A = this chain, B = another copy of it.
Amino acid sequence: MSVTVPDKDWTLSSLSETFDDGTQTLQGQLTSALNALAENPSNPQLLAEYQSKLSEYTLYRNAQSNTVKVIKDVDAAIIQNFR
């Protein structure tokens, strides 16, 4: 998916929304797997799927918050250089 020159379409919210909306479905699957295990804890497959999606979820938030942190630094650097 091509992105219009970021120069003009640099929006921090949009970047976060990408990380959110693109994982919202996967978050539902994670919590669905939880409910599945609640019914049947003794399913190795559900345990694997749940724990995988759970570990992935951790990575999902890591990438999200890290990206935002970087953008903050960029914005602040500009302000400081023109401070």
Contact = CB atoms under 8 A, between A and B. Distances in A.
A51 B78 contact: yes
Interface in A51-83: 51-52, 54-79, 81-83
B20 A45 contact: yes
Given A5-B24, A62-B76, 18 more contacts: A5-B28, A6-B28, A7-B20, A10-B40, A16-B48, A42-B56, A44-B61, A47-B75, A47-B79, A48-B61, A48-B64, A51-B82, A59-B72, A59-B75, A59-B79, A65-B81, A66-B79, A68-B82
15 contacts: A1-B32, A6-B30, A7-B24, A8-B45, A13-B42, A34-B67, A44-B61, A52-B82, A54-B67, A54-B70, A58-B77, A59-B72, A65-B78, A66-B81, A68-B82
